[PDB]
Amino acid sequence: PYLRARGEVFSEIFPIDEAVVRVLVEELKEAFEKYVANHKSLRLDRYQL
Amino acid sequence: PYLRARGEVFSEIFPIDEAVVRVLVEELKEAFEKYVANHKSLRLDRYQL
Numbered sequence: 001p002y003l004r005a006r007g008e009v010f011s012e013i014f015p016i017d018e019a020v021v022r023v024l025v026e027e028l029k030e031a032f033e034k035y036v037a038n039h040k041s042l043r044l045d046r047y048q049l
Numbered sequence: 050p051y052l053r054a055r056g057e058v059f060s061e062i063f064p065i066d067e068a069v070v071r072v073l074v075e076e077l078k079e080a081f082e083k084y085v086a087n088h089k090s091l092r093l094d095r096y097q098l
Binding site: 016017018019020 | 089090091092093094095
């Protein structure tokens with residue numbers, strides 16, 4: 001007490017290869033879609049995505 | 050070192066049978082299309098097809 005860290009600057013990585021990102025975003029989209037549809041043990045908010 | 054050389058002669062020939070040129074450009078782009086399909090994790094910005 002009290003813990004600190006001597007801070008950095010933020011780690012800054014930037015996207016290249018973005019159409020594979022487009023395929024993987026629509027895969028993410030259908031994936032999370034059917035994830036919400038399946039796992040009803042989540043009781044999730046269903047008005048947001 | 051260093052290097053300085055002198056040239057011999059010109060030699061520059063061409064193919065014949067331009068149908069091989071046309072359909073082989075098509076099959077060449079087929080092969081590199083398959084390699085760009087393989088390029089999913091190969092860090093490629095995607096507008097060179």
